[PDB]
């Protein structure tokens, strides 16, 4: 996989070049913004169980056909698998946040996922809704101004939203 730094290095190597004054400045800024990134990962991770459970409850309340006998989330084994998927997706999204790049999310999670759901008969459009719910909850938690040094994390939240939407699009 790659993180934001390795990504720039890989691009420079393909061209056989040393980094430019600008590239150095860009990477240095990422470092200066590191604290905020660490807070977002810690905050989301620390509330992972509630983010998944709350999103799952909301999904089934909105879409009761999923839990109705015959539905794809009916039976404990399917419900467990569904809950697991939510947790897995959230897990990989947080990895992307820490890395500052979506490579790990794309390679280890999203790639081939749509084809997996199609083969199983799982409604990807419904998974997308679940992802969107976790997205809104994850950002509200990460960007909560309480109990943290005051500052602007808007760019980071936009980046985080991007990963969630990316995952949602990969299944929807």
């Amino acid at each position: 996989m790659l993180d934001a730094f390795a990504k720039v290095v890989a691009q420079a190597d393909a061209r056989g070049e040393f980094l430019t004054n600008a590239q150095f400045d860009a990477l240095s800024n990422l470092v200066k913004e590191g604290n905020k990134r660490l807070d977002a990962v810690n905050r989301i991770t620390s509330n992972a169980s509630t983010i998944v459970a709350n999103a799952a409850r909301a999904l089934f309340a909105e879409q009761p056909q999923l839990i109705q006998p015959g539905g794809n989330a009916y039976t404990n084994r399917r419900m467990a698998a569904c809950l697991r998927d939510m947790e897995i997706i959230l897990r990989y999204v947080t990895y992307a946040i820490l890395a500052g790049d979506s490579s790990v999310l794309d390679d280890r999670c999203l790639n081939g996922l749509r084809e997996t759901y199609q083969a199983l008969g799982t409604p990807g459009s419904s998974v997308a809704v679940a992802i969107q719910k976790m997205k809104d909850a994850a950002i509200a938690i990460a960007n909560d101004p309480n109990g943290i040094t005051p500052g602007d994390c808007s760019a980071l939240m936009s980046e985080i939203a991007g990963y969630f939407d990316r995952a949602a699009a990969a299944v929807a």
Binding site: L2, N42, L98
Partner: protein, 162 residues
Amino acid sequence: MKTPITEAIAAADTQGRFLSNTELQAVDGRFKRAVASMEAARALTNNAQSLIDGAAQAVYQKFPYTTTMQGSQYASTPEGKAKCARDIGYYLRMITYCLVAGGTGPMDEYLIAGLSEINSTFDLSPSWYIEALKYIKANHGLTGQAAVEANAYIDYAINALS
């Protein structure tokens, strides 16, 4: 590619768990050390040409037979001299990438892997490159932790050739 961040993620992923404080502290260590690493990276890049030119001559001086012996694997011809300078530039570039990434990953992937096979096949002596790396270490002009950073990756390359 091996960096403190990808390494943190790999650990959590192999265990199928979310990142914990154990991993986050590692990344913070990396973010804090970046200051010194970037200082080293910028300096080596800024001074790349003189370091490369000087390193090549250091090799020719230590191993004079590399400038006169017949054979494409020596620097006895314009072409050989160009290949040599190119190679030394590759090493220096890799060192700067490692400093930027905060790990050995770049050098491990683009250079060390297959290194033994290449030197054996093309009859290139590892001793030549070690001398060039020693020159860069002795003359990069860095001090303090920026020097510690630069030297760690230069010595890493030297050990890979030993």
